[PDB]
Design a binder for this molecule. Sequence first.
Ligand SMILES: Cc1n[nH]c(C)c1-c1c(-c2cccc(OC(C)C)c2)n(CCC(=O)O)c2ccc(C3CC3)cc12
Length: 136
Amino acid sequence: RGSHMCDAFVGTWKLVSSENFDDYMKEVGVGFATRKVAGMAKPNMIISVNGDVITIKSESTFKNTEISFILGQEFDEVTADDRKVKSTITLDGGVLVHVQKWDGKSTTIKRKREDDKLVVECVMKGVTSTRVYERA
Ligand SMILES: Cc1n[nH]c(C)c1-c1c(-c2cccc(OC(C)C)c2)n(CCC(=O)O)c2ccc(C3CC3)cc12
């Protein structure tokens, strides 16, 4: 019950830049209207740890959601775009790797600290979106 290295992710984060998000979304299969409304949002992301359980929440004009999970242990997740997926989050040397699977597809969201930023890379097949957060 002392420090985690994940206690580098802990806190409150605000989105400060987005690249290629619409394309990432299209590749995922997100509908037009949802893409438009989601891409406008400037969420905060709140990350906390309590023993082995990591919680990530979004505070967003698009959708307020939360996930709680244990590294390496699969869980059910209903995404903001209303996909029902099976997810697993692991820590691969400093990077939090979030894999979502549904209908024989998958997408990977990687989150890592760089300088004072938390960089989120969303990947679907060959399309990558980079979403950059700073401390709130
Ligand atoms: C849950 C939510 N509310 N408002 C936004 C924006 C989102 C959203 C998040 C997000 C942002 C902050 C925290 C967060 O936490 C959850 C893991 C609880 C998710 N991600 C993850 C990648 C990112 O940080 O933008 C998304 C990836 C794709 C999509 C589009 C609909 C398909 C939306 C999001």
